[PDB]
Chain A
Amino acid sequence: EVVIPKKKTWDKVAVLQALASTVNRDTTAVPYVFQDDPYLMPASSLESRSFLLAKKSGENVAKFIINSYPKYFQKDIAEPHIPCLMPEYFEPQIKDISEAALKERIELRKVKASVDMF
């Protein structure tokens, strides 16, 4: 009478996994993390190590600035709210032994725990 193809469900990453497996690794080319121009082209192991370590240090500097001044990036301009992009909050609340104890496992340190045991 009528034939209908059945529906399927995919992961958002599965399509791009297919696209990536379609293509092999780039030949005669440094990793994608490194730039393409020849001057910035890291041409040795030690200097490349130092380079991506400087990049990671910039990442840590970004973390430091964001967690030091959260109010600047507090605006959620993007329509999809993302905690990965939201600023980070390791701020102890007001004196409250029960909520402070619940926040212990959230702050991930030891001075708060000493003070709470006290």
Chain B
Amino acid sequence: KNRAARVRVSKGDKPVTYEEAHAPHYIAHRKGWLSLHTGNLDGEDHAAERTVEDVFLRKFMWGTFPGCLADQLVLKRRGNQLEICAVVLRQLSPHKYYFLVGYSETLLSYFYKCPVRLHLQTVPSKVVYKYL
């Protein structure tokens, strides 16, 4: 019995989505990697820096867009430019959405001295994979 990146089976009255529904030994078989970079490949370096920085990205963005997200993010790093993809709920106003988007994007660009972009997909209610 191993407990790792898996949700306990409940009565069947709580939504669960694809990524946490599937096991961590199903990552490459039936999932995709959340972060996209080449530091893990051979010949590259700074993999520790990549991991720490992208973990900080995820933390800061999850906590600066609280209550609207319902799933993990998608990071896409093609050379210099960084891209983020999020799925959120239509809870708060588009005013707040755009304001926080611009604010956080400017902060990340200024901090990492790097071109950053981010996109968001609104959903009325978080898509459930199954009821476990």
Instruction: Give the interface of A toward B (CB within 8 A).
Output: 35-37, 39-40, 42, 47, 50-52, 54-59, 61-63, 65-66, 72-73, 76-78, 82, 85, 87
Q: How far is the CA of A9 from the CA of B90 in the complex (A)?
A: 50
- The answer on a CB contact under 8 Å between A61 and B113 is no
Assess whether B114 is interfacial by the CB under 8 Å rule.
yes
Segment of B2-10, B12-20, B33-41, B115-123 in the binding face:
B115-123
- The answer on a CB contact under 8 Å between B114 and A58 is no
Interface secondary structure of A, over-half rule: helix
- The answer on a CB contact under 8 Å between B106 and A35 is no
B62 CB contacts on chain A under 8 angstroms: none
The residue on A at minimum CB distance from B103 is: A58
- Taken residue by residue from 81 to 114, chain B's Cβ proximity to chain A (1 for < 8 Å, 0 otherwise) reads as 0000000001000110111111100110111111
Say yes or no: A39-B122 contact (C-beta < 8 A), given A55-B98, A72-B111: yes
B100 CB contacts on chain A under 8 angstroms: 58
Q: Which of A37, A50, A66 contacts B110 (CB 8 A)?
A: A66
Instruction: Give the interface of B toward A (CB within 8 A).
Output: 90, 94-95, 97-103, 106-107, 109-114, 119-122
The residue on A at minimum CB distance from B96 is: A54
Q: Which of A58, A63, A65 contacts B98 (CB 8 A)?
A: A58
Offer 14 A-B interface pairs, CB within 8 angstroms, sorted by A: A37-B121, A40-B97, A40-B122, A51-B94, A52-B98, A54-B99, A59-B102, A62-B103, A62-B107, A65-B107, A72-B111, A76-B113, A77-B113, A82-B113
B97 CB contacts on chain A under 8 angstroms: 40
Q: How far is the CA of A50 from the CA of B95 in the complex (A)?
A: 8
Distance to closest chain B CB from A78 (angstroms)? 3
Given contacts A56-B102, A58-B100, A77-B113, 19 further A-B contacts (CB under 8 A): A37-B121, A39-B90, A40-B97, A40-B122, A42-B94, A50-B95, A52-B98, A54-B99, A58-B102, A59-B102, A61-B99, A61-B106, A62-B102, A62-B103, A62-B110, A66-B106, A77-B112, A85-B110, A87-B110
Q: How far is the CA of A62 from the CA of B119 in the complex (A)?
A: 19
